Amino acid sequence: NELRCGCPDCHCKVDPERVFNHDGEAYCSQACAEQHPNGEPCPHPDCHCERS
Ligand SMILES: [Cd+2]
Ligand SMILES: [Cd+2]
Ligand SMILES: [Cd+2]
Ligand SMILES: [Cd+2]
Known part of the structure; x- marks a missing residue:
């Protein structure tokens, strides 16, 4: 996958x-x-990662 999301x-x-x-x-x-920083997830409809 090479670049794997940090x-x-x-x-x-x-x-x-x-x-x-x-x-x-x-x-x-x-x-x-x-x-x-603002609290938005990534532009992918697979997950809902966000800070908490
Ligand atoms: Cd990501
Ligand atoms: Cd993503
Ligand atoms: Cd994500
Ligand atoms: Cd994320």
Whole structure:
């Protein structure tokens, strides 16, 4: 899968063509990269990862 979402709960295959690199990690979206700053889950209808 190469780039595996840095989010511990959220497992999404990330593409190096278009990946949000934050703090050196590859996340499926910036929401996971920013550790859900505003409180939004990732743009994938598989899970509902968010901070709590
Ligand atoms: Cd997720
Ligand atoms: Cd994610
Ligand atoms: Cd997440
Ligand atoms: Cd995702």
